[PDB]
């Protein structure tokens, strides 16, 4: 409805703060390209929510023209606006956002650093790799987590040994994220540190370790995973069982044969069923 877009467009210059940000929101939802340049202008409104909302709306229209102005909004005095700008750019996906996002890895607001790491992950540009490896050292656990998620998604081998060390983190969220990222990268050097992680206090860590070992598909995991079938946590158990099927072969078909014979409980059940299949 062109008549509505235009009205919200003029609404961008209203005197009411509320009318300005509600107009930038609505334009964002309509998603019409004609609003891009007027929204580019709102990125400098005296009021932060208006700016926040202009940046968000541009993330949504997805027009590459918003990129340089959004790169500027990354330096906004207000941390909400910077968050909204980093989110908008990761969503547009334009490689020009890359070095500015890398700079936002050092913002004083820990949310900005976090969504910067995420935006980087979404773009997939290998230049983010070493800076994201720095961020595994961040004072903030969520930032450390975000960085490992972004590294797993990027898939660059250089992330591996820094991710291994993150399996040693004090926070169970980062440990969970490091294991997940290692499973996704699928480098065999993770196989041994993940086997340890199967004995973690946090059951979210054990779950991800097991899953990660299933993806990796290396055979040294079989017996450590047979054991995890006796795990107190139900989800750790089911996942260990999933992981065993993913690593096919006969070595596991032989662990499955003895287990059908000398096994009890869930562990016996997956043995017969696996054998029933293959």
């Amino acid at each position: 409805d062109p008549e509505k877009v235009e009205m919200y467009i003029k609404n961008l210059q209203d005197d009411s703060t509320t009318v300005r940000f509600n107009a930038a929101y609505a334009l964002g939802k309509i998603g019409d390209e004609r609003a891009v340049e007027p929204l580019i202008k709102a990125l400098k409104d005296e009021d932060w929510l208006v700016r926040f909302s202009a940046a968000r709306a541009l993330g949504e229209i997805g027009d590459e023209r918003a990129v340089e102005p959004l790169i500027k909004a990354l330096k906004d005095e207000d941390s909400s606006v910077r968050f909204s700008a980093a989110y908008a750019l990761g969503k547009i996906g334009d490689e020009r956002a890359v070095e500015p996002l890398i700079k936002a890895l050092k913002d004083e607001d820990p949310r900005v650093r976090r969504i910067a790491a995420g935006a980087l992950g979404e773009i997939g540009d290998e230049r983010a790799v070493e800076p994201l490896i720095k961020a595994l050292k961040d004072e903030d656990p969520y930032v450390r987590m975000a960085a490992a998620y972004a590294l797993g998604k990027i898939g660059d081998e250089r992330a591996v040994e820094p991710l291994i060390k993150a399996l040693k983190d004090e926070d169970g969220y980062v440990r969970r994220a490091a294991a997940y990222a290692l499973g996704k990268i699928g480098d065999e050097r993770a196989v041994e540190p993940l086997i340890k992680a199967l004995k973690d206090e946090d059951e979210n860590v054990r779950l991800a370790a097991a899953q990660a070992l299933g993806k990796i598909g290396d055979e040294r995991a079989v017996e450590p995973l047979i054991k995890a079938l006796k795990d107190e946590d139900r989800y750790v158990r089911l996942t260990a069982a999933r992981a065993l099927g993913k690593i096919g072969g006969e070595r596991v078909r032989a662990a499955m044969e003895k287990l059908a014979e000398t096994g009890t409980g869930f562990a016996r059940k997956v043995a017969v069923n696996y054998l029933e299949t293959h």
Binding site: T17, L49, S79, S80, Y87, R111, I115, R176, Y235
Partner: protein, 155 residues
């Protein structure tokens, strides 16, 4: 129902739902909650409270005179529930548009997580999870999608 119990664009924003707007703004500032619980309405709540307490989070609760005992029993800084029998409560000693932006307001005063309690509809769970994504909040609840908001930080 739709009322709170305790015991700048932020102003232009709150106004939409003007003197009590500023009052129920000082709400969000004073305590500055680190957590919002979302529930249906009672074992679900005892969990969520000490689940939130597990991270030492001073918290708010949202759900749709039991409501007054939640204060002593859980320590909440505020409850939000969802006629006009609020007057009974006030006596006892307890005081186009994007409504979801309240999350950004709370975040700036220190909000860090949502905690979803048992029995929320799927509709409600995805709405809470969408908000965690879009406002960069944590959300705490069988598999991968428990951490969807971290795996897919850009929606």
């Amino acid at each position: 129902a739709f009322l709170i119990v305790k015991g700048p664009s932020a102003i232009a924003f709150l106004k939409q739902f003007h003197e009590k707007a500023e009052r129920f703004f000082e709400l969000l500032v004073r305590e500055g909650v680190e957590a919002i619980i979302i529930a249906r309405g009672e074992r679900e709540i005892e969990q969520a409270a000490k689940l939130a307490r597990e991270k030492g989070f001073e918290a708010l609760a949202f759900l749709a005179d039991d409501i007054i005992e939640y204060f002593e029993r859980y320590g909440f800084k505020a409850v939000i529930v969802a006629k006009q029998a609020a007057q009974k409560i006030e006596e006892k000693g307890f005081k186009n548009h994007n409504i979801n932006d309240i999350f950004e307001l709370l975040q700036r005063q220190g909000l860090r997580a949502i905690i979803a309690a048992t029995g929320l509809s799927e509709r409600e769970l995805s709405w809470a999870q969408r908000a965690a994504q879009q406002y960069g909040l944590d959300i705490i609840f069988e598999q991968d999608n428990r951490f969807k908001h971290f795996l897919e930080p850009i929606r």
